[PDB]
Amino acid sequence: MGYLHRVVEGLKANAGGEALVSADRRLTGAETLEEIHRTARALAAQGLRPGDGVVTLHGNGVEAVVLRIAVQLLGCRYAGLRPVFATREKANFLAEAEAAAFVYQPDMADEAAELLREVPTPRVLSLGPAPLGEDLVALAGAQSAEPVEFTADERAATAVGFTAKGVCRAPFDLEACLDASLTIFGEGPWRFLVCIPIADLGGEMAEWTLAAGGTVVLREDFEPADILATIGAERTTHVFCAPGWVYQLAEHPALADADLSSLTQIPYGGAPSTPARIADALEKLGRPLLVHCYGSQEGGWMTWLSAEDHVRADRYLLNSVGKALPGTEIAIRDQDGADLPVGTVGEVCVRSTMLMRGYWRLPELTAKTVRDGWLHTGDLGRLDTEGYLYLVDRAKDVIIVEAYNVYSQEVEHVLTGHPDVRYAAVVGVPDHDTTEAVYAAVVPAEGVGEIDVDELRALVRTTLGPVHEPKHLDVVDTIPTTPRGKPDKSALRTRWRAAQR
């Protein structure tokens, strides 16, 4: 058994039905498994052993999934360049990757040249006929479809996902991730719309979709009109979305008429969500679909918020990423690294069998990052007693000054406690080039004449420490608020930013 055992088992399970689907080609589990075996054989022929690095430059086609899996079957290291990266960044990735092969989609030959020019690589192959190297699809066609058993170290990296640096994953932790996927997404066959690069997260999600006996529906990227069409046309059960995408789906005029019956779930994540707009989306979908996932290449799946937990009447949880997965442990830690009680804000630190094997060729930063089995995620948040995780909103609630975290509520509370101040709003605003500064607006109390701004600066300095001191501090008659009754801190930020003459 193992990760690839699991993928193959799901394909065999699904041999009669659809496994890989795109606008251009359609394969069954039988037809998919054959190509994988053939491709693996062909790659083996070219001279590729376990541990040998295989860099790819492709899109989200069927042959790209076949290749990603095949490379991993041999126990080679698949290293997908996402096409969205700049050529400068790809050349770095390729240079550092110690590649033995380079595999590129035919219509990207322009870029393959730029790269192979700068980083000459052996065994160049093309997914179909193309100017450079040989044609891998042709090589595979001419080849035995006899099964290829997985026979490498289950704990040896077979995938690198790029981020300035590359995250190695081994089958051991990939299976751990697949297990969580069944927790979050449910079990059984999934018709899973993947429009994330197969070069990384999309690839993982395709591997998993297949392992569970499912069909992958591939699109090249997210566009709301496609997708709404694709969902109904392919009777998809799941589409994984960035939060941005969820909003675009919800705001789309085509949505009233689109057929979403097939959907059981719209898992989303990858970036901070906007509670207000998620709530809009809940109303328009008019059904419990949204499931918030919190994950990284480094940490695997860490938490998730069920669909029901988006709409319970007794709690509000749109500011939550939900609770730990089975086998996942979460501590919140001070800038030095001892635990904090529930309720307190710190760095979210995780330990599960889903952690990455490490950063590629960066063994020192790997140790700065995973410390004694515990991933230091660099994200800031708080747990609660019911077990829910809440990541601070970095725009409203933190300010980073000289590499120190300043919390806006802490500064507000201190200012407000001055008898001359009845209300404060504190926000970080862009300063010189790439720094942040603490700005503050305070509302005077009843009868207060003139406010001594310097006194309030001293108060913060000699309560919290020097860095928490507001650089700028305006006395205002009021703080604008949002329609949900929270202080409008982006209005304050925009206003202060624009006035920096």
Author numbering: 1 to 163, 170 to 507
Question: What does the literature reporting this entry say, word for word?
Answer:
Later, an additional structure of ShABS was also obtained from crystallization of the wild-type enzyme in space group P6322 (Data set #3), which had been cocrystallized with the amide product 10a. This ShABS structure (ShABSopen) displayed a rotation, as determined using the Dyndom server, of the cap domain of 81° in the opposite direction to the rotation observed between McbAAd and McbAAm, to expose the active site completely. Although no electron density for a ligand was observed, as the enzyme in these experiments had been complexed with the amide product, we speculate that this conformation may be representative of an exit protein-product complex assumed by ShABS following product release.
Amide Bond Synthetases (ABSs) actively catalyze both the ATP-dependent adenylation of carboxylic acid substrates and their subsequent amidation using an amine nucleophile, both within the active site of the enzyme, enabling the use of only a small excess of the amine partner. In this report, we describe the activity and specificity of an ABS from Streptoalloteichus hindustanus (ShABS), with a broader, complementary substrate spectrum to that of McbA that includes enantioselective behavior toward an expanded range of acid and amine partners in amidation reactions. The requirement for large excesses of amine in these reactions has prompted investigations into the ATP-dependent amide bond synthetase (ABS) class of enzymes, also members of the larger ANL (acyl-CoA synthetase–non-ribosomal peptide synthase–luciferase) family of adenylase enzymes, as these catalyze both the formation of the adenylate and the amidation reaction within one active site of the enzyme and require only one or low equivalents of the amine as a coupling partner. In common with other adenylases, McbA features a larger N-terminal domain coupled to a C-terminal “cap” domain.
